[PDB]
Amino acid sequence: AVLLSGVPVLAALDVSTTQKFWIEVLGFTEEFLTEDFGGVSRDGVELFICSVEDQVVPDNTQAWLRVRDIDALHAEWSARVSSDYADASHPAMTAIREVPWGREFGLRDPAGNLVHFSELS
Amino acid sequence: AVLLSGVPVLAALDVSTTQKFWIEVLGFTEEFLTEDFGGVSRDGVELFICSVEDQVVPDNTQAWLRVRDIDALHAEWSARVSSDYADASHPAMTAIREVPWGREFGLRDPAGNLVHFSELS
Numbered sequence: 391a392v393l394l395s396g397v398p399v400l401a402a403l404d405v406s407t408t409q410k411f412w413i414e415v416l417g418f419t420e421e422f423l424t425e426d427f428g429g430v431s432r433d434g435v436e437l438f439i440c441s442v443e444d445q446v447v448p449d450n451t452q453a454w455l456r457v458r459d460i461d462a463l464h465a466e467w468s469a470r471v472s473s474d475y476a477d478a479s480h481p482a483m484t485a486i487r488e489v490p491w492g493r494e495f496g497l498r499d500p501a502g503n504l505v506h507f508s509e510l511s
Numbered sequence: 512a513v514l515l516s517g518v519p520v521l522a523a524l525d526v527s528t529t530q531k532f533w534i535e536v537l538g539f540t541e542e543f544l545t546e547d548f549g550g551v552s553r554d555g556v557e558l559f560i561c562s563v564e565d566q567v568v569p570d571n572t573q574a575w576l577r578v579r580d581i582d583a584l585h586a587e588w589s590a591r592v593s594s595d596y597a598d599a600s601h602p603a604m605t606a607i608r609e610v611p612w613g614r615e616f617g618l619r620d621p622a623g624n625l626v627h628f629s630e631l632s
Contacts, residue, residue, distance in 0.1 A: 391584035393556040397575035398519040435514040442571050450568045452561060454518035463512035 398453035399438045402501035408439050411481065411500050415470050439501075448502035460486060460509040464495055471497065519574035520559045523622035529560050532602065532621050536591050560622075569623035581607060581630040585616055592618065 402408040409428040412418045421429035421436065428439040435455060442448065457463055464486050471483040475498065484496045494508035523529040530549040533539045542550035542557065549560040556576060563569065578584055585607050592604040596619065605617045615629035 391578060391580040391582075391587065393554040394577040394579055396517055396519050396556045396558060397577065398517050399573040399575065401571065433514040435517045437517060438573075438575060440573060444567055444571070446565055447568055447571045450522065450563050450565070451572065452520040452559075454520065454559060456515040456518065457512060458515055459512040461512075466512065 395436075397436045397438055398455075398505075399440050400453065400499070400501065400503040400505075401442045401448040401451045402439055402503070403442065403445060403448070404501070405439050405441050408499060408501040408503075412437065412439070415481075416467065416497075445502065451503045452506065453503070454506045454508055457507050457509055460493055460495065460507060463507060467497070516557075518557045518559055519576075519626075520561050521574065521620070521622065521624040521626075522563045522569040522572045523560055523624070524563065524566060524569070525622070526560050526562050529620060529622040529624075533558065533560070536602075537588065537618075566623065572624045573627065574624070575627045575629055578628050578630055581614055581616065581628060584628060588618070 405426060405428045406423065409423055409430060412430045413420055418430035418432045421431055426441040430437055467483055471481050473483060475482040475484055481500050482498050486493055486495045492508055492510040494506050497505050526547060526549045527544065530544055530551060533551045534541055539551035539553045542552055547562040551558055588604055592602050594604060596603040596605055602621050603619050607614055607616045613629055613631040615627050618626050
């Protein structure tokens with residue numbers, strides 16, 4: 391038995407809207423969408439999105455995506471996603487930060503999930 | 512910018528205990544452990560484990576791991592993890608199920624996270 395890859399599952403009270411963001415704003419390709427369960431990918435890296443009935447769940451859900459050329463990716467998204475992280479009514483994206491293992495930025499989606507885009511250095 | 516891989520983040524009120532399960536029971540290799548944040552991997556596939564203060568979060572957290580030879584993996588774990596899913600006091604593992612996209616089993620860890628081990632067919 392060999393493990394092949396891992397697929398983070400984001401949570402959302404509204405799967406469809408959250409998936410539309412990952413696709414149209416962030417530039418992921420749709421894999422599938424049902425009412426309760428959605429999937430997207432970019433460069434073969436997949437993320438699923440599953441419905442929940444309590445907002446505390448997505449507000450406490452995270453994922454990491456390892457990237458190459460984090461600078462290009464942040465620039466792609468800088469016009470599209472607010473840098474005002476303190477405003478919880480909209481998605482937002484942090485600046486790129488240097489952390490002890492590499493560089494990363496965080497992105498909070500419309501559902502509340504926090505995804506870390508990171509590069510090892 | 513190229514995405515390289517995705518890393519699911521499990522939730523837990525007790526990170527250390529949950530990581531000890533993934534390592535000692537499930538046979539993952541430790542990557543790191545701090546009080547609030549842990550990492551493991553197997554065949555290069557990583558999972559992180561992050562602390563939360565509300566049990567509803569891990570009880571509603573999922574991940575998918577794509578595998579090859581799901582039958583070998585289930586057999587590896589069958590003596591080690593109860594098949595009594597209805598008993599919530601211990602980890603448990605479902606039987607392998609045929610789903611419209613392939614075959615899969617679910618594993619609920621001590622923290623409450625549900626991870627799906629799946630094979631495409």
